[PDB]
Amino acid sequence: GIIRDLLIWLEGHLDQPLSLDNVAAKAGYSKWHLQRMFKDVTGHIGYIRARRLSKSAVALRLTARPILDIALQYRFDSQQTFTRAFKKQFAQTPALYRRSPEWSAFGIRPPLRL
Template sequence: MDYHTKVRDSLKYIDENLNHKIDLDDLAKRAYLSKYHYHRIFHKVSGESVTRYITKRRMEKAAGELARTDRPIIDIALEYQYASQESFSRAFLKIYGLTPGKYRRRYGGNSSDQVINLSCRFNKNMNMAA
């Protein structure tokens, strides 16, 4: 199994478990790599750290829910593993430049293809010799 496949499998697992705790140790074990080596390979293939990728994917999902539903912001924050609405709002503001409430007012009622996409670009042609 090559590194690209391991990272692709990890991306699939992450996307299927965004509303659960995702641990770097568990991801590394699933890929049969050490935590250090896994993180290094993930960064090289995806262009960003595991933590950053997970945060961005959770924010994309949360942004989609903010735009398409009337669910309370605290419920969305808790679903995507934030301990409080305040911590979720700070993280959301840092990524989108808007608070979740302002984002909802601006983009509410939009279909999923109009929600701002933050996903990394998977570098399929990256030389893994390093």
């Protein structure tokens, strides 16, 4: 029942509030108990990383800002830490992703509309 409210706030707050699990522990419950409370609902929450990589991927293709704002806008640690997450997930360079004139759904994790 209760932690429905985490789902689309996370659609809205992968932004300027740097939310970690202890910042996600501000949703009422503990660090370890929110995990399995999210697990049997969804199957897959720390999804957040995907939204961070999905949520950064609105900035590559659909806004004209270059790459250095992107690795620090949507709450990743660094430009290699971004591309470490990028290459584990999308298996590309984002300089080889946005510059390419074609773009399809290989690595971009969907948001949970459960």
